[PDB]
Each structure stands twice: as structure tokens, then as C-alpha cells.
């Protein structure tokens, strides 16, 4: 029983980062080295764990989080980072144990004139807690006067479209991200290497 990593990494559409997707990986055998040995990924960074030794490890569960962000935002998907993504969309904890995997998806996620399906949260009063997911669409109140759900001055829609467009520079191009979290608890281990 192999782990359905193919469902995740080769998924045909991806989620918006504000509504990032999470699949629970459990009760399976995980061959990680098919991912690590691959020349497919421009980012493959692990924390609290060595990427070489992944096939020798068992875990209680593995969570696979996936979404799409800008190229120059991939650096925010790491412990201790700040910015629009890390503060307002997807936050990793300081004691993160797992791997961050990303690759350029310009050929898939950009269209002529702009692909407007992928969204990010632009306005938020406070930072996200780690692994928090905010899918609210309340009009953001930037002043003292209440918005009453109506857009206007000091009353902005909190989500914005990336508008990916294939002539973008690399920092503005879409990248697909998969974040594997590993938790080791005082419970039976459902995910082991081969």
C-alpha cells in the first residue's frame, strides 16, 4: 500500500494559498526518495529531518499541504518568515518538522491576458497562527467607519487575484508548493518508509 503522493504532486488543479489544501497521508508505505532524487523541483528544503534518511523513518501522520504562490514568495514557506503569504495566508511554526517542495508552474498556471483563479489574502488585521486557514471574505475595515459589507474607501475586499501572465518575470511567476509535515506522537505509526 503506497502512499498517494501522486495524487498530491501531480494533481491537475491546485488550491489558492488562502484556502490551502491538506490531505492526511496515513496507513501506507512512503517512498520519499522518488521525490528527492528528482530534478523536477527548484525548492526541496527539509527541517528537523534529513532528506536522505526519509525512507528509514516512521511517523504517526504526514500532512501534505499544497497551493500556488509567486516565485519570490516561496521563500516565505519556511520557519521564521514574514510577508503577505507567511503572515496572512500560510504560516509554518518555528518547530517545523517536514519538507517544503516547490516547482515553477508557469506553463500550467498562467494564461495570456492573465489567469485570475489563484487568490491570496492581501488585507488582514493580525498574523495567522501556524497551520491556520482563513477563508473569510468579509470586507476589510481600514478605518473607523464600518463597511457593512460594501466596498469603498477604507473598505476593501480582502482577497486579490495573482493574475498570472506568462510574460511575468520569474519572481512573479506561479510556483506550485507541497509542504510535507511529519508528526511523531505517543501513538501507533501509520506512515513508514519501504
Amino acid at each position, epitope marked *: 500500500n503506497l502512499c498517494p503522493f501522486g495524487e498530491v504532486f501531480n494533481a491537475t488543479r491546485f488550491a489558492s494559498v488562502y484556502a490551502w489544501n491538506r490531505k492526511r497521508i496515513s496507513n501506507c508505505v512512503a517512498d520519499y526518495s522518488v521525490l528527492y532524487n528528482s530534478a523536477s523541483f527548484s525548492t526541496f528544503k527539509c527541517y528537523g529531518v534529513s532528506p536522505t534518511k526519509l525512507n528509514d523513518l516512521c511517523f504517526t501522520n504526514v500532512y501534505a499541504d499544497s497551493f500556488v504562490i509567486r516565485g519570490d514568495e516561496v521563500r516565505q514557506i519556511a520557519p521564521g518568515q514574514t510577508g503577505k503569504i507567511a503572515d496572512y495566508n500560510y504560516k509554518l511554526p518555528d518547530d517545523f518538522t517536514g519538507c517544503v517542495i516547490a516547482w515553477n508552474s508557469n506553463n500550467l498556471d498562467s494564461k495570456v*491576458g492573465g489567469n485570475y483563479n489563484y487568490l491570496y489574502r492581501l488585507f488582514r*488585521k493580525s498574523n495567522l497562527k501556524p497551520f491556520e486557514r482563513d477563508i473569510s471574505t468579509e470586507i476589510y475595515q481600514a478605518g473607523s467607519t464600518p463597511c457593512n459589507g460594501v466596498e469603498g*474607501f477604507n473598505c476593501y475586499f480582502p482577497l486579490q487575484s495573482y493574475g498570472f*501572465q506568462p*510574460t511575468n*518575470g520569474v519572481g*512573479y511567476q506561479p510556483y506550485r508548493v507541497v509542504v510535507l509535515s511529519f508528526e511523531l506522537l505517543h501513538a501507533p505509526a501509520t506512515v513508514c518508509g519501504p
Partner: antibody, heavy 117, light 109 residues
Framework: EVQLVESGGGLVQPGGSLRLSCAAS????????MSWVRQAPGKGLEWVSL???????YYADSVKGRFIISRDNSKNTLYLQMNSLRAEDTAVYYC???????????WGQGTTVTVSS | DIQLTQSPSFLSASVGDRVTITCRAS??????LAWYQQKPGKAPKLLIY???TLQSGVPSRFSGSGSGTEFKLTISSLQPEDFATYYC??????????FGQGTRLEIKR
């Protein structure tokens, strides 16, 4: 009603310190992106610093580690603490409410900083 | 680092003319562009955001166009109060050249 008023500029020697203030009205500084933009005499606009609603702060490399952006939520005021000043820091300094993809829509009148021996 | 270059640095026109100022990004930045007006001794004033969206209050004789690397600000019929310096700003990115070097609109004779 919606305005930004700045103060605190003046003459200082290199290596000295200055604290610029930026009192807002018409919006809440704690709920907005706020940035500082400066304009050396006879030149263009240079972005300097930025502070998020959530508290994150960013600085241009020309001032990295010398300037500190902060705010007072009760006074609805934005600050810029300027340390280890150099001659090239001479400029008119502006604070502005940053609306990101909607640009910077509210600017102050500017305060003048001169750094010289 | 993505850079903005504005050209020309100085441009002369007269009242009633159609004026077009150009700004280039060293790489494609979609519509993440803003335009500002500045008069001597005064703060910048926001004109257009999102490359083409007019800011509330700005007269309709101002229009912005372009997506990618070449952006244009057009004034349909120049007014005496329009003689100023115009600045280019890239949005959702704060590199050393967040603002272009500016184009000064001056009176022809």
C-alpha cells in the same frame, strides 16, 4: 479629514539620530500598510520602509539596520527612528498609507532632514 | 531586481495636446503598476493603480495602459495644471528601484 501630517525633521550631524512622526486622520494606522518614502534634493522617490498591520517591518538595503519603523496605536501615529545618519540620508521624507495593489493614496506634506558635518 | 526606467526624462508640450509618457519594467510585472503626479515642493498624488484603473477624484483626461513591461500614461487634452513630474511605481514589490526616475512635463515654446 483624511490627511497625514509629518514632523521631526531638522539638521543633524553624521552619526546622529532623528525620530520622524506621522500623525494620521481618516484611517487607522494599526489596520493599514504604511510606508516611508524619501526624495533627496533634486532626485526621485526612494522607498525606505514599510510596516504591516500584523507587525512585520521591511527596509530598503540603503537603510537596513539603521532605521526602525514603528507606530502608536492610541495616538494613530506612525514613526521612523533614524540612527547612524549619513550625508546621503539628506532628503524630504514622506509617510504614506500603502494600499498595495491600489497604490499609495494618502501622502503627508513631507518633513525635511539634513545630515551634514 | 526588477527595475523601472522612465523615458523621456523631460518632455515639452502645450495646452490641449495629447501627451503620452512611457515606463518600462526590466521584467514582466503584469498590471502591478501605479502612476503618480508631483509638483515642485508638494507630495506625490496617486493617479492610476493596477496599470489602468483611475484613482477616485482624478480627472478622466488621465488614462493608463499596458501590461507586462511597457506601460503608458496618457493625457487626452493637456491642462495648465498638468505640467508636473510624473513617476512610475511597481506594485507588490519593493526593490531598490520601486519608483521610476520620473518624467517632467514642461511648457513648449
Amino acid at each position: 479629514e483624511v490627511q497625514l501630517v509629518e514632523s521631526g525633521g531638522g539638521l543633524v550631524q553624521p552619526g546622529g539620530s532623528l525620530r520622524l512622526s506621522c500623525a494620521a486622520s481618516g484611517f487607522t494606522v494599526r489596520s493599514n500598510y504604511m510606508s516611508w518614502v524619501r526624495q533627496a534634493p533634486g532626485k526621485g522617490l526612494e522607498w525606505v520602509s514599510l510596516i504591516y498591520s500584523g507587525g512585520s517591518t521591511y527596509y530598503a538595503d540603503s537603510v537596513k539596520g539603521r532605521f526602525i519603523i514603528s507606530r502608536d496605536n492610541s495616538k494613530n501615529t506612525l514613526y521612523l527612528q533614524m540612527n547612524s545618519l549619513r550625508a546621503e540620508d539628506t532628503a524630504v521624507y514622506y509617510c504614506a498609507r500603502d494600499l498595495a495593489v491600489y497604490g499609495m493614496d494618502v501622502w503627508g506634506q513631507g518633513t525635511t532632514v539634513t545630515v551634514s558635518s | 531586481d526588477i527595475q523601472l526606467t522612465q523615458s523621456p526624462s523631460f518632455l515639452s508640450a502645450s495646452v490641449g495636446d495629447r501627451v503620452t509618457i512611457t515606463c518600462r519594467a526590466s521584467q514582466g510585472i503584469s498590471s502591478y503598476l501605479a502612476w503618480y503626479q508631483q509638483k515642485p515642493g508638494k507630495a506625490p498624488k496617486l493617479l492610476i493603480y493596477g496599470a489602468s484603473t483611475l484613482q477616485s477624484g482624478v480627472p478622466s483626461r488621465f488614462s493608463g495602459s499596458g501590461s507586462g513591461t511597457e506601460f503608458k500614461l496618457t493625457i487626452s487634452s493637456l491642462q495648465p495644471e498638468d505640467f508636473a513630474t510624473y513617476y512610475c511605481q511597481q506594485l507588490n514589490n519593493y526593490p531598490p528601484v520601486t519608483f521610476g526616475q520620473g518624467t517632467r512635463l514642461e511648457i513648449k515654446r
